[PDB]
Design a protein around this ligand. Structure first.
Ligand SMILES: O=C(O)Cc1c[nH]c2ccccc12
Ligand SMILES: O=C(O)Cc1c[nH]c2ccccc12
Lengths: 104, 105
């Protein structure tokens, strides 16, 4: 299923729309408007999920909590641990090194 | 006491966890790591939804796209237009005014 000019054109547009959000948020942090901006663009349950994903990443990096603890404390089952681990492994090395410094 | 202690305790925890995310992202922006951090913490489908929500807010603020165009171009039917409009109305006026300056020019 190789990509066509139609599919490539749509994918480029979606990427530019994502970058426009990223840039809006960047400027909101510089204006101290990021809290209401994130409340406008993210639903309550989405904000809750992001806060939980940070805890999962933190605990996976620390390597102390067992899988049972991850489930009971964070609601994180084996599937989400596996995905979370894959995303950590796929991260650029500069990000992983920075997350170990900030979260730990 | 707006809530009972079980609900208050949960809310307090979620609130601290959300602010932890917000500060991590703040510092990622300052370190130029925001793009990989957002790839790590947001699924591709979520990133697409946020990019689309920005277009929806832009078009609701601009006032020129019709209801049928919002549906056909952005997948925004009546219910999502209504919710989007309600969120805009609930926003502090300062943010709405800033969005018009930043998105519309
Ligand atoms: O995979 C998911 O279900 C959501 C998700 C996105 N980024 C994450 C990082 C850690 C744990 C879960 C996620
Ligand atoms: O209501 C939704 O389905 C998600 C959503 C969150 N913030 C929004 C702004 C504009 C349009 C939709 C949304």
């Amino acid at each position: 299923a190789q990509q066509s000019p139609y599919s490539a054109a749509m994918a480029e547009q979606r990427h530019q729309e994502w970058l426009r959000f990223v840039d809006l948020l960047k400027n909101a942090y510089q204006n101290d408007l990021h809290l209401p901006l994130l409340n406008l663009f993210l639903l309550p349950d989405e904000r809750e999920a992001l806060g939980t994903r940070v805890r999962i990443v933190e605990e996976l990096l620390r390597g102390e909590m067992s899988q049972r603890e991850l489930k009971n404390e964070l609601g994180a089952g084996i599937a989400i641990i596996t995905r979370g681990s894959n995303y950590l492994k796929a991260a650029p090395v500069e990000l992983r090194q920075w997350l170990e410094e900030v979260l730990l």
